[PDB]
Tab-separated table of C-alpha atoms in Angstrom:
chain	number	residue	atom	x	y	z
A	1	UNK	CA	-118.590	98.923	111.432
A	2	UNK	CA	-116.164	97.014	109.140
A	3	UNK	CA	-118.227	95.306	106.309
A	4	UNK	CA	-116.417	92.079	104.866
A	5	UNK	CA	-117.281	91.864	101.009
A	6	UNK	CA	-118.681	88.569	101.627
A	7	UNK	CA	-114.221	90.262	86.362
A	8	UNK	CA	-112.248	87.338	88.102
A	9	UNK	CA	-110.343	84.874	86.088
A	10	UNK	CA	-112.104	82.002	85.318
A	11	UNK	CA	-111.884	78.590	88.010
A	12	UNK	CA	-111.474	76.242	84.470
A	13	UNK	CA	-110.051	77.389	80.890
A	14	UNK	CA	-110.557	74.819	78.029
A	15	UNK	CA	-107.373	74.528	75.798
A	16	UNK	CA	-108.615	74.721	72.211
B	1	UNK	CA	-102.331	66.269	61.489
B	2	UNK	CA	-105.480	65.530	59.319
B	3	UNK	CA	-105.148	61.710	59.717
B	4	UNK	CA	-106.559	62.458	63.488
B	5	UNK	CA	-109.005	65.315	62.464
B	6	UNK	CA	-113.108	64.386	62.911
B	7	UNK	CA	-112.684	60.718	64.472
B	8	UNK	CA	-115.664	59.032	66.016
B	9	UNK	CA	-115.703	58.232	69.594
B	10	UNK	CA	-115.937	54.687	68.725
B	11	UNK	CA	-112.817	55.122	66.514
B	12	UNK	CA	-110.853	56.662	69.234
B	13	UNK	CA	-111.995	53.381	71.578
B	14	UNK	CA	-110.939	51.363	68.902
B	15	UNK	CA	-107.508	52.772	68.640
B	16	UNK	CA	-106.588	53.433	72.246
B	17	UNK	CA	-107.819	49.857	73.082
B	18	UNK	CA	-105.149	48.376	70.893
B	19	UNK	CA	-102.094	46.651	71.386
B	20	UNK	CA	-99.759	49.267	69.864
B	21	UNK	CA	-98.645	52.117	71.597
B	22	UNK	CA	-98.418	54.355	68.294
B	23	UNK	CA	-102.179	53.688	67.455
B	24	UNK	CA	-103.042	54.786	71.019
B	25	UNK	CA	-101.220	57.903	70.646
B	26	UNK	CA	-102.746	58.698	66.901
B	27	UNK	CA	-106.370	57.553	68.792
B	28	UNK	CA	-105.304	60.044	71.642
B	29	UNK	CA	-104.572	63.128	69.273
B	30	UNK	CA	-107.732	62.476	67.441
B	31	UNK	CA	-109.481	62.905	71.072
B	32	UNK	CA	-107.890	65.849	72.185
B	33	UNK	CA	-108.639	67.345	68.280
B	34	UNK	CA	-112.371	66.289	69.183
B	35	UNK	CA	-111.917	67.911	73.028
B	36	UNK	CA	-110.102	70.959	71.229
B	37	UNK	CA	-113.146	72.294	68.653
B	38	UNK	CA	-114.872	75.575	70.045
B	39	UNK	CA	-118.801	74.024	70.024
B	40	UNK	CA	-119.593	71.743	72.138
B	41	UNK	CA	-116.904	69.498	72.938
B	42	UNK	CA	-118.244	65.772	73.259
B	43	UNK	CA	-116.599	65.554	77.064
B	44	UNK	CA	-119.584	63.485	78.028
B	45	UNK	CA	-119.741	60.878	75.278
B	46	UNK	CA	-115.389	60.599	75.983
B	47	UNK	CA	-116.530	59.580	79.527
B	48	UNK	CA	-119.142	57.679	78.618
B	49	UNK	CA	-116.580	55.511	76.509
B	50	UNK	CA	-114.011	54.638	79.657
B	51	UNK	CA	-111.437	56.455	78.259
B	52	UNK	CA	-110.369	58.501	81.404
B	53	UNK	CA	-108.353	55.868	82.972
B	54	UNK	CA	-106.321	54.913	79.589
B	55	UNK	CA	-105.678	58.788	79.457
B	56	UNK	CA	-104.204	58.583	82.910
B	57	UNK	CA	-101.891	55.727	82.632
B	58	UNK	CA	-100.668	57.740	79.463
B	59	UNK	CA	-99.709	60.264	81.487
B	60	UNK	CA	-96.854	57.861	82.994
B	61	UNK	CA	-95.376	56.865	79.698
B	62	UNK	CA	-91.899	58.630	79.877
B	63	UNK	CA	-90.644	56.797	76.894
B	64	UNK	CA	-93.599	58.319	74.655
B	65	UNK	CA	-93.525	61.679	75.950
B	66	UNK	CA	-95.914	62.945	72.924
B	67	UNK	CA	-98.420	60.416	74.552
B	68	UNK	CA	-98.081	62.301	77.607
B	69	UNK	CA	-98.737	65.375	75.879
B	70	UNK	CA	-101.837	64.468	74.004
B	71	UNK	CA	-103.447	62.688	76.911
B	72	UNK	CA	-102.896	65.497	79.477
B	73	UNK	CA	-104.652	67.860	77.359
B	74	UNK	CA	-107.319	65.646	76.933
B	75	UNK	CA	-107.687	65.397	80.442
B	76	UNK	CA	-107.248	69.187	80.495
B	77	UNK	CA	-110.274	69.557	78.525
B	78	UNK	CA	-112.251	66.850	80.236
B	79	UNK	CA	-111.251	69.062	83.747
B	80	UNK	CA	-112.537	72.183	82.462
B	81	UNK	CA	-116.087	70.941	82.161
B	82	UNK	CA	-118.581	70.411	85.121
B	83	UNK	CA	-117.837	69.647	88.438
B	84	UNK	CA	-119.009	66.120	87.560
B	85	UNK	CA	-116.851	66.534	84.313
B	86	UNK	CA	-113.552	67.129	86.813
B	87	UNK	CA	-114.566	65.077	89.383
B	88	UNK	CA	-114.569	61.891	86.772
B	89	UNK	CA	-110.394	62.762	86.067
B	90	UNK	CA	-109.646	63.344	89.663
B	91	UNK	CA	-111.499	59.457	90.013
B	92	UNK	CA	-109.631	58.406	87.469
B	93	UNK	CA	-106.306	59.261	89.508
B	94	UNK	CA	-105.235	62.291	87.331
B	95	UNK	CA	-104.018	64.609	90.427
B	96	UNK	CA	-100.505	62.303	91.203
B	97	UNK	CA	-99.874	61.613	87.682
B	98	UNK	CA	-100.328	65.033	86.722
B	99	UNK	CA	-97.892	66.373	89.732
B	100	UNK	CA	-95.444	63.886	88.553
B	101	UNK	CA	-95.522	65.316	84.998
B	102	UNK	CA	-94.443	68.735	86.701
B	103	UNK	CA	-90.982	67.647	86.729
B	104	UNK	CA	-90.929	66.585	83.175
B	105	UNK	CA	-88.014	67.679	81.164
B	106	UNK	CA	-90.419	68.955	78.249
B	107	UNK	CA	-91.952	72.226	78.988
B	108	UNK	CA	-95.192	72.046	76.993
B	109	UNK	CA	-95.667	68.943	78.772
B	110	UNK	CA	-94.980	70.383	82.604
B	111	UNK	CA	-97.181	73.505	81.384
B	112	UNK	CA	-99.627	71.034	80.300
B	113	UNK	CA	-100.142	69.545	83.485
B	114	UNK	CA	-99.479	73.061	85.466
B	115	UNK	CA	-102.791	73.847	83.309
B	116	UNK	CA	-104.623	70.195	84.331
B	117	UNK	CA	-103.724	70.899	87.892
B	118	UNK	CA	-105.324	74.557	87.798
B	119	UNK	CA	-108.504	73.151	86.267
B	120	UNK	CA	-108.898	70.736	89.199
B	121	UNK	CA	-107.704	72.826	91.928
B	122	UNK	CA	-110.420	75.645	90.169
B	123	UNK	CA	-113.239	73.014	90.681
B	124	UNK	CA	-113.610	74.298	94.408
B	125	UNK	CA	-112.062	73.868	97.966
B	126	UNK	CA	-111.945	70.011	98.495
B	127	UNK	CA	-110.392	69.533	95.049
B	128	UNK	CA	-107.946	72.433	95.478
B	129	UNK	CA	-107.177	71.055	98.944
B	130	UNK	CA	-106.628	67.639	97.409
B	131	UNK	CA	-104.520	68.849	95.034
B	132	UNK	CA	-102.261	70.250	97.762
B	133	UNK	CA	-102.214	66.986	99.428
B	134	UNK	CA	-100.724	65.232	97.035
B	135	UNK	CA	-98.261	67.856	97.220
B	136	UNK	CA	-98.186	69.874	94.071
B	137	UNK	CA	-96.964	73.082	95.823
B	138	UNK	CA	-93.129	72.418	95.839
B	139	UNK	CA	-92.838	71.320	92.489
B	140	UNK	CA	-95.185	74.306	90.923
B	141	UNK	CA	-92.987	76.515	93.347
B	142	UNK	CA	-89.767	74.717	91.895
B	143	UNK	CA	-90.500	75.972	88.487
B	144	UNK	CA	-91.019	79.604	89.122
B	145	UNK	CA	-87.097	79.243	90.975
B	146	UNK	CA	-85.174	81.127	88.469
B	147	UNK	CA	-83.184	84.233	89.116
B	148	UNK	CA	-85.337	86.479	86.657
B	149	UNK	CA	-89.238	85.473	86.007
B	150	UNK	CA	-88.341	87.174	82.331
B	151	UNK	CA	-86.241	84.401	80.910
B	152	UNK	CA	-89.367	82.023	81.130
B	153	UNK	CA	-91.671	81.824	78.397
B	154	UNK	CA	-94.659	84.241	78.572
B	155	UNK	CA	-97.494	81.685	78.075
B	156	UNK	CA	-95.735	79.320	80.691
B	157	UNK	CA	-95.358	82.426	83.319
B	158	UNK	CA	-99.289	82.952	83.217
B	159	UNK	CA	-100.735	79.688	82.938
B	160	UNK	CA	-98.434	79.113	86.301
B	161	UNK	CA	-99.507	82.159	87.816
B	162	UNK	CA	-102.937	81.353	87.020
B	163	UNK	CA	-103.018	77.983	89.177
B	164	UNK	CA	-101.047	79.225	91.941
B	165	UNK	CA	-103.849	81.923	92.155
B	166	UNK	CA	-106.725	78.544	92.096
B	167	UNK	CA	-104.591	77.443	95.101
B	168	UNK	CA	-105.411	80.070	96.853
B	169	UNK	CA	-109.094	80.692	95.435
B	170	UNK	CA	-112.005	79.090	97.356
B	171	UNK	CA	-112.782	79.733	101.077
B	172	UNK	CA	-115.332	77.443	103.615
B	173	UNK	CA	-112.429	76.592	104.089
B	174	UNK	CA	-109.771	78.548	103.326
B	175	UNK	CA	-106.392	77.439	101.951
B	176	UNK	CA	-104.628	75.902	104.323
B	177	UNK	CA	-102.516	78.851	106.473
B	178	UNK	CA	-99.678	76.285	105.945
B	179	UNK	CA	-99.997	76.395	102.346
B	180	UNK	CA	-100.307	80.008	101.817
B	181	UNK	CA	-97.295	80.546	103.731
B	182	UNK	CA	-95.497	78.258	101.850
B	183	UNK	CA	-96.801	80.238	98.618
B	184	UNK	CA	-97.127	83.952	99.688
B	185	UNK	CA	-93.198	84.712	98.775
B	186	UNK	CA	-93.623	83.621	94.953
B	187	UNK	CA	-96.668	85.422	94.595
B	188	UNK	CA	-95.077	88.829	95.887
B	189	UNK	CA	-92.350	88.196	93.198
B	190	UNK	CA	-95.168	87.582	90.495
B	191	UNK	CA	-96.439	90.675	91.898
B	192	UNK	CA	-93.896	92.871	90.713
B	193	UNK	CA	-93.526	91.181	87.326
B	194	UNK	CA	-94.182	93.714	84.435
B	195	UNK	CA	-96.737	90.898	82.410
B	196	UNK	CA	-100.042	92.419	82.477
B	197	UNK	CA	-101.868	89.030	82.828
B	198	UNK	CA	-99.635	88.031	85.099
B	199	UNK	CA	-100.077	91.067	87.182
B	200	UNK	CA	-103.552	90.704	86.929
B	201	UNK	CA	-103.782	87.153	88.433
B	202	UNK	CA	-101.439	87.555	91.127
B	203	UNK	CA	-103.678	90.459	92.323
B	204	UNK	CA	-106.827	88.185	91.856
B	205	UNK	CA	-104.902	85.544	93.970
B	206	UNK	CA	-104.075	88.121	96.900
B	207	UNK	CA	-107.531	89.275	96.986
B	208	UNK	CA	-108.623	85.504	97.591
B	209	UNK	CA	-105.795	85.516	100.544
B	210	UNK	CA	-107.333	88.872	102.083
B	211	UNK	CA	-111.135	88.098	101.986
B	212	UNK	CA	-111.372	86.681	105.299
B	213	UNK	CA	-110.327	86.759	109.000
B	214	UNK	CA	-107.968	89.334	110.008
B	215	UNK	CA	-105.383	86.631	110.563
B	216	UNK	CA	-105.370	86.249	106.960
B	217	UNK	CA	-104.793	89.622	105.898
B	218	UNK	CA	-102.266	89.891	108.223
B	219	UNK	CA	-100.295	87.117	106.700
B	220	UNK	CA	-100.359	89.184	103.746
B	221	UNK	CA	-100.186	92.459	104.990
B	222	UNK	CA	-96.667	91.202	106.583
B	223	UNK	CA	-95.314	90.325	103.704
B	224	UNK	CA	-95.215	93.847	102.244
B	225	UNK	CA	-97.438	94.005	99.372
B	226	UNK	CA	-99.428	97.224	100.270
B	227	UNK	CA	-97.224	99.623	98.635
B	228	UNK	CA	-97.082	97.678	95.661
B	229	UNK	CA	-100.766	97.130	95.192
B	230	UNK	CA	-101.150	100.443	95.722
B	231	UNK	CA	-99.080	101.603	92.789
B	232	UNK	CA	-101.424	98.636	90.594
B	233	UNK	CA	-104.124	100.941	91.875
B	234	UNK	CA	-103.428	103.507	89.595
B	235	UNK	CA	-102.282	100.631	86.478
B	236	UNK	CA	-104.098	101.711	83.222
B	237	UNK	CA	-105.552	98.265	82.456
B	238	UNK	CA	-108.864	97.806	83.761
B	239	UNK	CA	-108.049	93.899	84.525
B	240	UNK	CA	-105.053	94.705	86.870
B	241	UNK	CA	-107.180	97.704	88.924
B	242	UNK	CA	-109.752	95.508	89.411
B	243	UNK	CA	-108.450	93.258	91.441
B	244	UNK	CA	-105.714	95.739	93.114
B	245	UNK	CA	-108.756	97.433	94.691
B	246	UNK	CA	-110.243	94.247	95.594
B	247	UNK	CA	-107.416	93.536	97.602
B	248	UNK	CA	-107.197	96.756	99.158
B	249	UNK	CA	-110.961	96.821	99.502
B	250	UNK	CA	-110.463	93.680	101.886
B	251	UNK	CA	-107.509	94.476	103.501
B	252	UNK	CA	-109.174	97.611	104.950
B	253	UNK	CA	-112.019	95.294	106.082
B	254	UNK	CA	-109.017	94.556	108.904
B	255	UNK	CA	-108.267	96.230	111.928
B	256	UNK	CA	-107.178	100.103	111.973
B	257	UNK	CA	-103.505	99.065	111.865
B	258	UNK	CA	-104.246	97.152	108.613
B	259	UNK	CA	-106.127	99.877	107.182
B	260	UNK	CA	-103.387	102.612	108.225
B	261	UNK	CA	-100.748	100.610	106.056
B	262	UNK	CA	-102.865	101.183	102.928
B	263	UNK	CA	-103.200	104.787	103.880
B	264	UNK	CA	-99.670	105.110	104.593
B	265	UNK	CA	-98.704	103.389	101.479
B	266	UNK	CA	-100.853	106.654	99.548
B	267	UNK	CA	-103.920	104.975	98.275
B	268	UNK	CA	-106.227	107.895	98.930
B	269	UNK	CA	-104.393	110.022	96.306
B	270	UNK	CA	-105.757	107.415	93.737
B	271	UNK	CA	-109.702	107.707	94.959
B	272	UNK	CA	-110.482	111.143	92.857
B	273	UNK	CA	-109.926	108.769	90.176
B	274	UNK	CA	-111.735	105.865	91.222
B	275	UNK	CA	-115.166	107.124	92.921
B	276	UNK	CA	-115.297	108.642	89.378
B	277	UNK	CA	-114.270	105.959	87.494
B	278	UNK	CA	-116.314	105.255	84.334
B	279	UNK	CA	-116.141	101.262	85.023
B	280	UNK	CA	-119.241	101.096	87.572
B	281	UNK	CA	-117.718	98.352	89.198
B	282	UNK	CA	-114.741	100.157	89.691
B	283	UNK	CA	-116.872	103.250	91.516
B	284	UNK	CA	-118.867	100.757	93.586
B	285	UNK	CA	-115.791	98.677	95.023
B	286	UNK	CA	-114.551	101.951	95.385
B	287	UNK	CA	-116.820	103.442	97.599
B	288	UNK	CA	-117.585	100.204	99.486
B	289	UNK	CA	-113.418	100.474	100.439
B	290	UNK	CA	-114.260	104.056	101.502
B	291	UNK	CA	-117.074	103.006	103.949
B	292	UNK	CA	-114.558	100.818	105.441
B	293	UNK	CA	-111.611	103.603	105.696
B	294	UNK	CA	-114.890	106.207	107.471
B	295	UNK	CA	-115.360	103.338	109.740
B	296	UNK	CA	-111.703	103.704	110.916
B	297	UNK	CA	-110.387	105.981	113.824
B	298	UNK	CA	-110.888	109.743	113.698
B	299	UNK	CA	-107.571	110.597	112.206
B	300	UNK	CA	-108.364	107.931	109.585
B	301	UNK	CA	-111.659	109.638	109.008
B	302	UNK	CA	-108.961	112.903	108.717
B	303	UNK	CA	-107.393	111.638	105.821
B	304	UNK	CA	-110.167	111.220	104.166
B	305	UNK	CA	-110.959	114.546	104.823
B	306	UNK	CA	-107.501	115.898	104.309
B	307	UNK	CA	-107.132	114.197	100.427
B	308	UNK	CA	-110.068	115.925	99.431
B	309	UNK	CA	-112.419	112.733	99.262
B	310	UNK	CA	-115.862	114.198	100.874
B	311	UNK	CA	-116.800	116.381	97.949
B	312	UNK	CA	-116.406	113.128	95.832
B	313	UNK	CA	-118.656	110.882	98.600
B	314	UNK	CA	-121.695	114.375	97.979
B	315	UNK	CA	-120.827	113.207	94.370
B	316	UNK	CA	-121.157	109.196	93.999
B	317	UNK	CA	-124.218	109.987	96.423
B	318	UNK	CA	-125.532	112.646	94.212
B	319	UNK	CA	-125.482	110.178	90.893
B	320	UNK	CA	-124.323	106.950	90.399
B	321	UNK	CA	-125.352	103.442	89.947
B	322	UNK	CA	-127.583	102.875	92.861
B	323	UNK	CA	-125.653	100.112	94.179
B	324	UNK	CA	-122.906	102.608	93.833
B	325	UNK	CA	-125.164	105.151	95.456
B	326	UNK	CA	-125.809	102.591	98.725
B	327	UNK	CA	-122.334	101.972	99.358
B	328	UNK	CA	-121.848	105.411	99.612
B	329	UNK	CA	-124.787	106.079	102.157
B	330	UNK	CA	-122.834	103.849	104.169
B	331	UNK	CA	-119.819	105.381	103.844
B	332	UNK	CA	-121.371	108.391	105.447
B	333	UNK	CA	-123.046	106.701	108.029
B	334	UNK	CA	-119.873	105.334	108.950
B	335	UNK	CA	-117.980	108.596	108.987
B	336	UNK	CA	-120.897	110.153	111.249
B	337	UNK	CA	-120.959	107.908	113.403
B	338	UNK	CA	-117.294	107.709	114.117
B	339	UNK	CA	-116.034	111.493	113.062
B	340	UNK	CA	-115.770	114.593	115.457
B	341	UNK	CA	-118.210	117.157	115.756
B	342	UNK	CA	-116.150	119.393	113.294
B	343	UNK	CA	-116.002	116.742	111.073
B	344	UNK	CA	-119.197	115.846	110.770
B	345	UNK	CA	-119.880	119.944	110.438
B	346	UNK	CA	-117.832	119.632	107.424
B	347	UNK	CA	-119.784	116.942	105.594
B	348	UNK	CA	-122.602	119.082	106.044
B	349	UNK	CA	-120.943	122.640	104.084
B	350	UNK	CA	-119.955	120.084	101.665
B	351	UNK	CA	-123.538	119.924	100.650
B	352	UNK	CA	-124.160	115.972	101.670
B	353	UNK	CA	-127.979	116.919	103.091
B	354	UNK	CA	-129.767	117.185	99.905
B	355	UNK	CA	-128.021	114.488	98.014
B	356	UNK	CA	-128.937	112.224	101.325
B	357	UNK	CA	-132.470	113.350	101.094
B	358	UNK	CA	-133.293	112.647	97.771
B	359	UNK	CA	-132.178	108.898	98.435
B	360	UNK	CA	-134.953	108.711	100.595
B	361	UNK	CA	-137.144	108.001	97.814
B	362	UNK	CA	-135.381	104.683	97.226
B	363	UNK	CA	-137.604	101.716	97.449
B	364	UNK	CA	-134.590	99.826	99.240
B	365	UNK	CA	-135.449	99.364	102.945
B	366	UNK	CA	-131.607	98.810	104.148
B	367	UNK	CA	-130.614	102.095	102.839
B	368	UNK	CA	-133.563	104.297	104.265
B	369	UNK	CA	-132.407	102.780	107.745
B	370	UNK	CA	-128.861	103.442	106.807
B	371	UNK	CA	-129.813	107.229	105.970
B	372	UNK	CA	-131.682	107.773	109.286
B	373	UNK	CA	-128.931	106.612	111.302
B	374	UNK	CA	-126.994	108.983	109.535
B	375	UNK	CA	-129.232	112.084	109.893
B	376	UNK	CA	-129.615	111.703	113.502
B	377	UNK	CA	-125.870	111.331	113.850
B	378	UNK	CA	-125.425	114.840	111.995
B	379	UNK	CA	-128.637	116.475	114.049
B	380	UNK	CA	-126.550	114.900	117.225
B	381	UNK	CA	-123.496	117.180	116.252
B	382	UNK	CA	-125.961	120.004	115.866
B	383	UNK	CA	-127.186	118.872	119.412
B	384	UNK	CA	-123.928	120.174	120.614
B	385	UNK	CA	-123.373	123.527	118.440
B	386	UNK	CA	-126.963	124.351	119.567
B	387	UNK	CA	-127.661	124.734	115.789
B	388	UNK	CA	-130.039	122.014	115.059
B	389	UNK	CA	-132.879	124.533	114.130
B	390	UNK	CA	-130.792	125.783	111.168
B	391	UNK	CA	-130.196	121.841	110.198
B	392	UNK	CA	-133.634	121.669	110.655
B	393	UNK	CA	-134.083	123.898	108.010
B	394	UNK	CA	-131.690	123.233	105.584
B	395	UNK	CA	-133.593	119.470	105.341
B	396	UNK	CA	-136.763	121.413	105.349
B	397	UNK	CA	-136.596	123.336	102.269
B	398	UNK	CA	-134.651	120.423	100.185
B	399	UNK	CA	-137.603	118.089	100.598
B	400	UNK	CA	-136.207	116.689	103.474
B	401	UNK	CA	-139.183	116.942	105.658
B	402	UNK	CA	-141.634	115.697	103.016
B	403	UNK	CA	-139.483	112.129	103.081
B	404	UNK	CA	-139.049	111.781	106.414
B	405	UNK	CA	-142.580	112.284	107.263
B	406	UNK	CA	-143.967	109.869	104.525
B	407	UNK	CA	-141.750	107.386	106.200
B	408	UNK	CA	-143.822	107.411	108.767
B	409	UNK	CA	-146.721	105.584	106.708
B	410	UNK	CA	-143.592	103.311	105.800
B	411	UNK	CA	-144.252	99.437	106.280
B	412	UNK	CA	-141.003	98.270	107.648
B	413	UNK	CA	-140.714	98.639	111.623
B	414	UNK	CA	-137.450	100.193	112.568
B	415	UNK	CA	-138.057	103.062	109.782
B	416	UNK	CA	-141.320	104.711	110.937
B	417	UNK	CA	-139.792	104.282	114.629
B	418	UNK	CA	-136.670	106.060	113.517
B	419	UNK	CA	-138.953	108.680	111.353
B	420	UNK	CA	-141.498	109.540	114.005
B	421	UNK	CA	-138.771	110.094	116.455
B	422	UNK	CA	-136.687	112.446	114.203
B	423	UNK	CA	-139.533	114.470	113.756
B	424	UNK	CA	-141.133	115.072	117.236
B	425	UNK	CA	-137.737	115.653	118.320
B	426	UNK	CA	-136.461	118.230	115.785
B	427	UNK	CA	-139.072	118.923	113.566
B	428	UNK	CA	-142.000	119.761	116.500
């Protein structure tokens, strides 16, 4: 019985 | 530069609508600065003013690299907003224009286009795939085609790595198989780089690629990254351990053979630290990972035993965040369903019973079912040894019978069925 997963870098970043 | 500070949007529009490229440049810079302030950049105002198409046309002005940079940056910041705001950048034709900038002779402009494409790809599967269809991958990879990564500016390398990880990122659907294959070799290389942020994002990307069907896992495992992942699993920087562990965890959701790669690489030796890690999430993911390993072959369970990890599972079950304990319950049920009688007995000698019984007081229904399954598998092991009597007593004098009996009054159907059963069958 394997069970798939189903603080990461953000999907978007603003440059300030 | 104070001459372009705090412009009104209407002043920006006035400047961009002039027939004067220098005036347009100054106005675009003023827009960048508006869009670059910390609190509430007026992205919607800038969009509403119809500026996006002009910014996009400025991307094409090879003879004025400053206005290419300013507009690239303005568009990056618009693309960093909501899906609707990113969509506005895409609808303006920004994707092919940014791809053309990837090859710019000016490093800061190339880098800006890398960042913009990362924001666009990061919006979701569809824009990710649209960036790939426009041919982003070849030029992106060409920027990393140098003998030694260390000769690249640190910030530049981090941005490229981050954008590549967004190209690997979403699912439903996952990235095109062809795009993954094209990207993987450069990813394996970044995964050996000495910069912690490059390593963090490289691992995140590998974790995205290994999150899916076993065929996806296989094309990653075939590239020989597992030893490097295991090394990174032991890093001191939490930002590196977290994605390394995610990738390792995904890889052991695969076939027995893919799982064996992780064990052979030496991953199990790191789990005494991971299963006691001060970061709650690391503990949780580590226990999840263990649950998939104990769902493996008996010889794989045996290596879990040999590495002294069963006492660590008893530990987590005895005291941990509840979500982690639930994972530990799964690890135990998987172990007990697949293990030999001797492995199962060993589990009991390590003290699994009491902590298991205490968790029968949990309000969560799923963990209760999981635990009853484990207890059944253990009784089953003890039947073959004719020691069911002795097991019954253990469960009794640690409050277990009180738990199981009460579970007959329990609401769920599947629970009272397993509970009543256990009683009549082993506790007369």
